Structure 1
Amino acid sequence: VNSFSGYLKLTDNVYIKNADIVEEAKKVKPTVVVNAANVYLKHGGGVAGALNKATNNAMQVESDDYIATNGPLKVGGSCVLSGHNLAKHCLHVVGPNVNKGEDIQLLKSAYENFNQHEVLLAPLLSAGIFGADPIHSLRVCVDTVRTNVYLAVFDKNLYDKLVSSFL
């Protein structure tokens, strides 16, 4: 039993909800919140920009130190950093950005990072400003993640379309 509330159960391990991931994180304080990161951990917009704003830019400060030490992530890769006031940890995961020409096959690799964590609150990778089809992203998530994933979907219209079209 965990503290996630009001989710629709999609499969054995995947749950979905129409919710702002920022407000969901602040209420649940999950062990792991997933950020829709880029390789430079520059959290300017989308889910990343919103999560960082909620940390009063502490996420960005921590991220800049991480990059200065380690260099950029790989597309499809991840790193674990602090969750600040939102979660114990933030798993920064880089899904491919279609608006940069990045290979969509890397979306499966991106979701594989979730399997290193027993329970996660996450957005749909490569959705929103990353330019991929959120329906496809959900399919890859379901077919790749084996740990317990709670998806927060910001747009109510998109949430209903995801549910109604789910196979």
Structure 2
Amino acid sequence: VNSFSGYLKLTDNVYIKNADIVEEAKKVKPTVVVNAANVYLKHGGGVAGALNKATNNAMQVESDDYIATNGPLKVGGSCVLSGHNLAKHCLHVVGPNVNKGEDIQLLKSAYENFNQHEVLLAPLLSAGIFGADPIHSLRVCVDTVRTNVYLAVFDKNLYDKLVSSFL
């Protein structure tokens, strides 16, 4: 039993809800919130910009130190950093950006990072400003993640389409 509330159950292990991931994190304080990161951990916009703003830029400060030490992530890769005021940990996951021409097959590799954590709050990877079809992202999620994932879909219109078309 966990504190996630109001989710629709898509599968044994995948759940979905129309919610702002920022507001959801402040309420649940999950062990792991997933960020829709880029390889540079530059959290300028999208989900990443929203999460970072909610941390008063502390996420960005920590991220800049991480990059200065370790260099950029790989597309499809991830790192665990602090969750600041939003969660215990933030799993920064880099899905491919279609608006950068990156291979959508890398989306499955990106979701595989979720399997290292028993429970996560997460967005649909590669959706939004990353350019991928969110219906495809939800499918890859369900077919790749085996741990318990609570998806927040910010757009109510997108949420209803994801649910109504979910196979």
TM category (shorter chain) comes to over 0.9
2:135 paired residue number: 135
How far apart are the structure 2 equivalents of 1:141 and 1:45? 23
1:122 paired residue number: 122
1:82 paired residue number: 82
State the identity as a percent: 100
Q: Secondary structure at the match of 1:95?
A: coil
The alignment yields a C-alpha RMSD, in angstroms, of 0.1
The Cα shift of 1:130 comes to 0.1
Q: Deviations over 1:39-80 (max 9, x none)?
A: 000000000000000000000000000000000000000000
Equivalent residues in 2 for 1:35-54, closer than 5 Å: 35-54=35-54
The Cα shift of 1:146 comes to 0.1
How far apart are the structure 1 equivalents of 2:17 and 2:8? 6
The count of aligned residue pairs is 167
The Cα shift of 1:91 comes to 0.1
Q: Deviations over 1:125-150 (max 9, x none)?
A: 00000000000000000000000000
1:155 paired residue number: 155
Q: Secondary structure at the match of 2:125?
A: coil
Q: Moved runs in structure 1, 4+ residues, more than 6 A?
A: none
The Cα shift of 1:118 comes to 0.1
What TM-score do you get using the length of structure 1 for normalisation?
1.00
What TM-score do you get using the length of structure 2 for normalisation?
1.00
Unmatched segments (≥5 aa) in structure 1? none
Q: Secondary structure at the match of 1:90?
A: strand
The Cα shift of 1:107 comes to 0.1
The Cα shift of 1:24 comes to 0.2
Q: Deviations over 1:92-128 (max 9, x none)?
A: 0000000000000000000000000000000000000
